Design an enzyme around this catalytic site. Sequence first.
Site: not given
Lengths: 170, 166
Positions: B56, B61, B64, B103, B114, B123, B127
Amino acid sequence: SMTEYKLVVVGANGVGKSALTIQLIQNHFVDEYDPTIEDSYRKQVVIDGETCLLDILDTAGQEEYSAMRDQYMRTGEGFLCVFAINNTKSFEDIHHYREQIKRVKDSEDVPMVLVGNKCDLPSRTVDTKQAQDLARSYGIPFIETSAKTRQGVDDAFYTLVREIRKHKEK
Amino acid sequence: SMVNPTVFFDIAVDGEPLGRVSFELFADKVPKTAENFRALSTGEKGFGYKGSCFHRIIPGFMCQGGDFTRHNGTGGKSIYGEKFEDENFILKHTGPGILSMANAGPNTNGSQFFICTAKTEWLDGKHVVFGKVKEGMNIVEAMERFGSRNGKTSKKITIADCGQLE
Ligand SMILES: Nc1nc2c(ncn2[C@@H]2O[C@H](COP(=O)(O)OP(=O)(O)NP(=O)(O)O)[C@@H](O)[C@H]2O)c(=O)[nH]1
Ligand SMILES: [Cl-]
Ligand SMILES: [Mg+2]
Protein backbone atom coordinates in the site's frame (compact mmCIF):
# COMPACT_ATOMS: atom_id res chain seq x y z
CA SER A 1 -35.85 7.12 -19.20
CA MET A 2 -32.45 7.36 -17.55
CA THR A 3 -31.58 8.49 -14.05
CA GLU A 4 -28.42 8.14 -11.93
CA TYR A 5 -27.94 7.39 -8.23
CA LYS A 6 -24.97 7.85 -5.92
CA LEU A 7 -24.93 4.87 -3.55
CA VAL A 8 -22.50 4.61 -0.63
CA VAL A 9 -21.72 1.29 1.08
CA VAL A 10 -20.80 1.66 4.79
CA GLY A 11 -20.26 -0.63 7.74
CA ALA A 12 -17.62 -2.13 9.99
CA ASN A 13 -14.43 -3.75 8.70
CA GLY A 14 -14.80 -7.23 7.25
CA VAL A 15 -18.60 -7.33 6.95
CA GLY A 16 -18.53 -7.80 3.17
CA LYS A 17 -19.01 -4.29 1.70
CA SER A 18 -16.49 -4.96 -1.05
CA ALA A 19 -17.57 -8.55 -1.67
CA LEU A 20 -21.17 -7.36 -2.15
CA THR A 21 -20.07 -4.56 -4.49
CA ILE A 22 -17.76 -6.84 -6.49
CA GLN A 23 -20.57 -9.37 -6.93
CA LEU A 24 -22.78 -6.59 -8.30
CA ILE A 25 -20.13 -5.13 -10.63
CA GLN A 26 -17.96 -8.12 -11.56
CA ASN A 27 -20.19 -11.17 -10.89
CA HIS A 28 -17.67 -13.10 -8.80
CA PHE A 29 -16.67 -13.76 -5.17
CA VAL A 30 -13.25 -14.58 -3.69
CA ASP A 31 -12.33 -15.69 -0.20
CA GLU A 32 -9.37 -13.33 0.02
CA TYR A 33 -9.79 -10.18 2.11
CA ASP A 34 -8.37 -7.13 0.31
CA PRO A 35 -8.84 -4.23 2.79
CA THR A 36 -10.41 -1.14 1.25
CA ILE A 37 -9.08 2.40 1.23
CA GLU A 38 -11.66 3.66 -1.30
CA ASP A 39 -13.08 2.31 -4.55
CA SER A 40 -15.72 3.58 -6.96
CA TYR A 41 -17.71 1.71 -9.62
CA ARG A 42 -20.38 2.45 -12.23
CA LYS A 43 -23.03 0.09 -13.62
CA GLN A 44 -26.11 0.55 -15.78
CA VAL A 45 -29.16 -1.44 -14.60
CA VAL A 46 -32.94 -1.49 -14.98
CA ILE A 47 -34.98 -1.33 -11.79
CA ASP A 48 -38.78 -1.46 -11.90
CA GLY A 49 -38.61 -0.86 -15.65
CA GLU A 50 -36.61 2.36 -15.23
CA THR A 51 -33.02 2.42 -16.48
CA CYS A 52 -30.41 4.02 -14.27
CA LEU A 53 -26.71 4.36 -13.73
CA LEU A 54 -25.48 3.30 -10.30
CA ASP A 55 -22.41 5.15 -9.01
CA ILE A 56 -21.23 3.00 -6.10
CA LEU A 57 -18.72 4.23 -3.52
CA ASP A 58 -17.20 1.31 -1.58
CA THR A 59 -15.87 2.80 1.65
CA ALA A 60 -13.48 1.45 4.26
CA GLY A 61 -14.75 0.34 7.65
CA GLN A 62 -12.05 2.54 9.21
CA GLU A 63 -13.40 4.58 12.10
CA GLU A 64 -11.40 7.81 11.98
CA TYR A 65 -11.27 10.44 9.21
CA SER A 66 -14.54 12.15 10.09
CA ALA A 67 -13.96 14.99 7.63
CA MET A 68 -13.47 12.66 4.67
CA ARG A 69 -16.33 10.40 5.63
CA ASP A 70 -18.65 13.38 6.10
CA GLN A 71 -17.82 14.27 2.48
CA TYR A 72 -18.89 10.79 1.35
CA MET A 73 -22.15 11.26 3.20
CA ARG A 74 -22.93 14.75 1.83
CA THR A 75 -22.58 13.50 -1.76
CA GLY A 76 -24.29 10.13 -1.32
CA GLU A 77 -27.99 9.82 -2.06
CA GLY A 78 -28.54 6.48 -0.35
CA PHE A 79 -26.61 4.26 2.03
CA LEU A 80 -26.23 0.50 2.30
CA CYS A 81 -25.51 -0.05 5.99
CA VAL A 82 -23.91 -3.49 6.16
CA PHE A 83 -23.25 -5.76 9.12
CA ALA A 84 -22.30 -9.44 9.21
CA ILE A 85 -24.75 -11.91 10.75
CA ASN A 86 -21.84 -13.59 12.60
CA ASN A 87 -20.37 -10.38 14.07
CA THR A 88 -22.46 -8.83 16.85
CA LYS A 89 -20.14 -5.83 17.18
CA SER A 90 -20.75 -4.98 13.52
CA PHE A 91 -24.49 -4.97 14.20
CA GLU A 92 -24.01 -2.79 17.30
CA ASP A 93 -22.03 -0.35 15.11
CA ILE A 94 -25.00 0.26 12.79
CA HIS A 95 -26.57 2.97 14.94
CA HIS A 96 -23.37 5.03 14.75
CA TYR A 97 -23.49 5.00 10.95
CA ARG A 98 -27.16 6.01 10.95
CA GLU A 99 -26.52 8.84 13.43
CA GLN A 100 -23.64 10.21 11.37
CA ILE A 101 -25.60 10.06 8.11
CA LYS A 102 -28.53 11.93 9.70
CA ARG A 103 -26.20 14.58 11.12
CA VAL A 104 -24.30 15.17 7.88
CA LYS A 105 -27.45 15.24 5.74
CA ASP A 106 -29.32 17.28 8.38
CA SER A 107 -32.37 15.06 8.17
CA GLU A 108 -34.05 12.17 9.92
CA ASP A 109 -35.29 10.82 6.55
CA VAL A 110 -32.29 9.58 4.53
CA PRO A 111 -32.56 6.69 2.03
CA MET A 112 -30.90 3.66 3.55
CA VAL A 113 -31.14 -0.13 3.68
CA LEU A 114 -29.93 -2.38 6.49
CA VAL A 115 -28.01 -5.36 5.05
CA GLY A 116 -27.22 -8.49 7.06
CA ASN A 117 -24.45 -10.20 5.08
CA LYS A 118 -22.74 -13.63 5.28
CA CYS A 119 -26.05 -15.50 5.64
CA ASP A 120 -24.41 -18.58 4.11
CA LEU A 121 -22.29 -19.13 7.25
CA PRO A 122 -23.22 -21.48 10.13
CA SER A 123 -21.88 -19.13 12.84
CA ARG A 124 -24.78 -16.66 13.20
CA THR A 125 -24.81 -14.43 16.29
CA VAL A 126 -27.42 -11.84 15.19
CA ASP A 127 -30.81 -13.32 14.56
CA THR A 128 -33.14 -12.11 11.83
CA LYS A 129 -35.66 -10.75 14.33
CA GLN A 130 -33.17 -8.37 16.01
CA ALA A 131 -32.23 -6.96 12.62
CA GLN A 132 -35.84 -6.70 11.45
CA ASP A 133 -36.73 -4.92 14.69
CA LEU A 134 -33.88 -2.44 14.28
CA ALA A 135 -34.83 -1.73 10.66
CA ARG A 136 -38.46 -1.28 11.68
CA SER A 137 -37.38 1.25 14.33
CA TYR A 138 -35.57 3.24 11.61
CA GLY A 139 -38.37 2.94 9.05
CA ILE A 140 -36.01 1.27 6.54
CA PRO A 141 -35.88 -2.11 4.77
CA PHE A 142 -33.79 -5.05 5.97
CA ILE A 143 -32.25 -7.40 3.37
CA GLU A 144 -30.30 -10.57 4.20
CA THR A 145 -27.44 -11.27 1.78
CA SER A 146 -24.58 -13.57 0.95
CA ALA A 147 -21.85 -12.19 -1.28
CA LYS A 148 -20.55 -15.76 -1.53
CA THR A 149 -23.69 -17.29 -3.04
CA ARG A 150 -25.01 -13.99 -4.48
CA GLN A 151 -28.25 -14.33 -2.44
CA GLY A 152 -29.89 -10.94 -2.08
CA VAL A 153 -27.11 -8.89 -3.71
CA ASP A 154 -29.22 -7.33 -6.47
CA ASP A 155 -32.12 -6.99 -4.03
CA ALA A 156 -30.02 -4.96 -1.59
CA PHE A 157 -28.85 -2.44 -4.19
CA TYR A 158 -32.18 -2.28 -6.06
CA THR A 159 -34.10 -1.77 -2.83
CA LEU A 160 -31.84 1.15 -1.97
CA VAL A 161 -32.64 2.74 -5.34
CA ARG A 162 -36.34 2.23 -4.60
CA GLU A 163 -35.80 4.01 -1.27
CA ILE A 164 -34.14 6.96 -3.04
CA ARG A 165 -36.98 7.18 -5.56
CA LYS A 166 -39.55 7.13 -2.75
CA HIS A 167 -37.68 9.88 -0.93
CA LYS A 168 -37.64 12.04 -4.04
CA GLU A 169 -41.44 11.75 -4.29
CA LYS A 170 -41.89 13.54 -0.94
CA SER B 1 24.54 6.04 16.45
CA MET B 2 26.34 4.49 19.40
CA VAL B 3 23.10 2.93 20.73
CA ASN B 4 20.53 2.61 17.98
CA PRO B 5 20.88 -0.12 15.34
CA THR B 6 20.86 0.67 11.63
CA VAL B 7 19.06 -1.67 9.24
CA PHE B 8 18.67 -1.51 5.48
CA PHE B 9 16.20 -2.52 2.79
CA ASP B 10 17.25 -2.98 -0.83
CA ILE B 11 14.06 -2.01 -2.66
CA ALA B 12 13.11 -3.59 -5.98
CA VAL B 13 10.55 -2.72 -8.66
CA ASP B 14 9.33 -5.85 -10.45
CA GLY B 15 12.61 -7.41 -9.33
CA GLU B 16 14.89 -4.59 -10.54
CA PRO B 17 16.98 -2.74 -7.93
CA LEU B 18 15.71 0.73 -7.15
CA GLY B 19 18.06 1.58 -4.29
CA ARG B 20 18.80 1.21 -0.61
CA VAL B 21 16.89 2.70 2.32
CA SER B 22 18.52 2.60 5.73
CA PHE B 23 16.77 3.21 9.04
CA GLU B 24 17.87 4.26 12.48
CA LEU B 25 15.87 2.18 14.98
CA PHE B 26 15.20 4.07 18.22
CA ALA B 27 16.09 1.24 20.60
CA ASP B 28 17.08 3.91 23.12
CA LYS B 29 13.44 4.97 23.52
CA VAL B 30 11.33 2.15 22.04
CA PRO B 31 13.45 -0.97 22.65
CA LYS B 32 10.98 -3.82 22.24
CA THR B 33 9.51 -2.41 19.04
CA ALA B 34 12.93 -1.52 17.61
CA GLU B 35 14.23 -5.01 18.40
CA ASN B 36 11.31 -6.67 16.60
CA PHE B 37 12.02 -4.67 13.44
CA ARG B 38 15.77 -5.28 13.70
CA ALA B 39 15.34 -9.05 14.02
CA LEU B 40 12.76 -9.20 11.22
CA SER B 41 15.25 -7.28 9.06
CA THR B 42 18.10 -9.73 9.70
CA GLY B 43 15.86 -12.80 9.45
CA GLU B 44 17.72 -14.27 12.41
CA LYS B 45 14.61 -15.90 13.92
CA GLY B 46 14.01 -17.81 10.66
CA PHE B 47 11.44 -15.42 9.17
CA GLY B 48 11.17 -11.75 8.38
CA TYR B 49 10.91 -9.03 5.78
CA LYS B 50 13.14 -10.33 2.98
CA GLY B 51 11.03 -10.88 -0.14
CA SER B 52 7.93 -9.11 1.19
CA CYS B 53 5.98 -6.35 -0.55
CA PHE B 54 5.10 -2.72 0.00
CA HIS B 55 1.44 -3.47 -0.66
CA ARG B 56 0.00 0.00 0.00
CA ILE B 57 1.64 3.21 -1.23
CA ILE B 58 -0.40 6.42 -1.09
CA PRO B 59 1.36 9.53 -2.41
CA GLY B 60 1.43 12.33 0.12
CA PHE B 61 1.00 9.96 3.06
CA MET B 62 3.00 6.76 3.45
CA CYS B 63 4.51 3.55 2.08
CA GLN B 64 3.27 0.49 3.99
CA GLY B 65 4.63 -3.05 3.94
CA GLY B 66 5.73 -5.96 6.09
CA ASP B 67 3.27 -8.84 5.49
CA PHE B 68 5.52 -11.88 5.09
CA THR B 69 2.94 -14.47 6.24
CA ARG B 70 -0.21 -13.94 4.15
CA HIS B 71 1.52 -11.86 1.46
CA ASN B 72 -1.68 -9.89 0.87
CA GLY B 73 -1.78 -7.03 3.41
CA THR B 74 -3.71 -8.92 6.09
CA GLY B 75 -0.89 -10.81 7.79
CA GLY B 76 1.67 -10.05 10.34
CA LYS B 77 3.85 -11.70 12.91
CA SER B 78 6.30 -10.35 15.45
CA ILE B 79 9.26 -12.04 17.14
CA TYR B 80 7.10 -12.12 20.30
CA GLY B 81 4.09 -13.88 18.82
CA GLU B 82 1.33 -12.90 16.43
CA LYS B 83 0.87 -9.53 18.18
CA PHE B 84 2.42 -7.38 20.90
CA GLU B 85 1.30 -4.41 22.93
CA ASP B 86 1.78 -0.74 22.11
CA GLU B 87 5.09 -0.10 23.87
CA ASN B 88 4.87 3.69 24.22
CA PHE B 89 3.81 6.83 22.37
CA ILE B 90 6.90 8.90 23.20
CA LEU B 91 7.62 9.73 19.56
CA LYS B 92 5.24 11.36 17.10
CA HIS B 93 4.64 11.30 13.34
CA THR B 94 6.49 14.53 12.74
CA GLY B 95 7.33 14.36 9.04
CA PRO B 96 8.79 12.41 6.12
CA GLY B 97 10.93 9.41 6.95
CA ILE B 98 9.26 8.48 10.23
CA LEU B 99 9.01 4.70 10.66
CA SER B 100 5.98 3.50 12.60
CA MET B 101 3.99 0.32 13.26
CA ALA B 102 0.84 -0.51 11.32
CA ASN B 103 -1.95 -2.05 13.37
CA ALA B 104 -5.59 -3.09 13.60
CA GLY B 105 -6.34 -1.15 16.78
CA PRO B 106 -4.82 -1.07 20.26
CA ASN B 107 -2.10 -3.60 21.07
CA THR B 108 -2.02 -5.39 17.69
CA ASN B 109 1.55 -4.76 16.48
CA GLY B 110 2.96 -7.56 14.35
CA SER B 111 5.32 -6.95 11.47
CA GLN B 112 3.54 -4.47 9.19
CA PHE B 113 5.01 -0.98 9.29
CA PHE B 114 4.84 2.26 7.36
CA ILE B 115 7.24 4.98 6.28
CA CYS B 116 5.71 8.44 6.37
CA THR B 117 6.19 10.73 3.40
CA ALA B 118 4.53 13.65 5.25
CA LYS B 119 3.54 14.61 8.77
CA THR B 120 0.68 12.30 9.87
CA GLU B 121 -0.21 13.74 13.27
CA TRP B 122 -3.64 12.08 13.45
CA LEU B 123 -1.77 8.78 13.97
CA ASP B 124 0.01 10.07 17.10
CA GLY B 125 -0.94 8.05 20.15
CA LYS B 126 -2.40 5.27 17.99
CA HIS B 127 0.66 3.96 16.10
CA VAL B 128 4.02 3.36 17.77
CA VAL B 129 6.83 5.37 16.15
CA PHE B 130 10.16 3.59 16.49
CA GLY B 131 12.63 4.73 13.83
CA LYS B 132 13.40 7.03 10.94
CA VAL B 133 14.95 6.84 7.50
CA LYS B 134 18.70 7.51 7.74
CA GLU B 135 19.79 7.35 4.10
CA GLY B 136 17.74 6.82 0.98
CA MET B 137 14.81 9.20 1.46
CA ASN B 138 15.16 9.77 -2.30
CA ILE B 139 14.43 6.05 -2.75
CA VAL B 140 11.30 6.33 -0.58
CA GLU B 141 10.23 9.31 -2.70
CA ALA B 142 10.76 7.18 -5.82
CA MET B 143 8.66 4.41 -4.26
CA GLU B 144 5.85 6.84 -3.45
CA ARG B 145 5.45 7.52 -7.17
CA PHE B 146 4.36 3.90 -7.84
CA GLY B 147 1.37 4.36 -5.55
CA SER B 148 -2.13 5.64 -6.12
CA ARG B 149 -5.03 7.17 -4.24
CA ASN B 150 -6.24 3.81 -2.94
CA GLY B 151 -2.70 2.52 -2.30
CA LYS B 152 -2.55 -0.03 -5.11
CA THR B 153 0.83 0.05 -6.82
CA SER B 154 1.45 0.10 -10.57
CA LYS B 155 4.48 -2.19 -10.24
CA LYS B 156 5.37 -4.64 -7.50
CA ILE B 157 7.58 -2.96 -4.90
CA THR B 158 9.51 -5.41 -2.73
CA ILE B 159 12.24 -5.77 -0.14
CA ALA B 160 14.73 -7.69 -2.28
CA ASP B 161 17.27 -7.87 0.54
CA CYS B 162 17.54 -6.52 4.07
CA GLY B 163 19.82 -6.73 7.06
CA GLN B 164 21.71 -4.86 9.75
CA LEU B 165 24.62 -2.49 9.13
CA GLU B 166 27.66 -2.41 11.44
N1 LIG C 1 -18.78 -16.68 3.73
C1 LIG C 1 -18.83 -15.39 3.37
N2 LIG C 1 -17.72 -14.66 3.41
C2 LIG C 1 -17.93 -13.39 3.02
C3 LIG C 1 -19.10 -12.80 2.60
N3 LIG C 1 -18.90 -11.47 2.29
C4 LIG C 1 -17.62 -11.28 2.50
N4 LIG C 1 -16.98 -12.41 2.94
C5 LIG C 1 -15.56 -12.53 3.28
O1 LIG C 1 -15.28 -11.67 4.37
C6 LIG C 1 -13.97 -11.06 4.20
C7 LIG C 1 -14.11 -9.56 4.22
O2 LIG C 1 -14.91 -9.15 3.09
P1 LIG C 1 -14.79 -7.70 2.46
O3 LIG C 1 -15.90 -7.57 1.44
O4 LIG C 1 -13.37 -7.45 2.07
O5 LIG C 1 -15.15 -6.81 3.74
P2 LIG C 1 -15.22 -5.19 3.82
O6 LIG C 1 -16.47 -4.85 4.58
O7 LIG C 1 -15.15 -4.64 2.44
N5 LIG C 1 -13.88 -4.80 4.71
P3 LIG C 1 -13.13 -3.26 4.73
O8 LIG C 1 -14.02 -2.36 5.56
O9 LIG C 1 -11.78 -3.47 5.42
O10 LIG C 1 -12.96 -2.81 3.31
C8 LIG C 1 -13.39 -11.66 2.93
O11 LIG C 1 -12.58 -12.79 3.25
C9 LIG C 1 -14.63 -12.09 2.15
O12 LIG C 1 -14.40 -13.20 1.28
C10 LIG C 1 -20.30 -13.60 2.58
O13 LIG C 1 -21.42 -13.24 2.25
N6 LIG C 1 -20.05 -14.90 2.99
CL1 LIG D 1 -10.26 13.67 8.60
MG1 LIG E 1 -13.81 -3.37 1.58
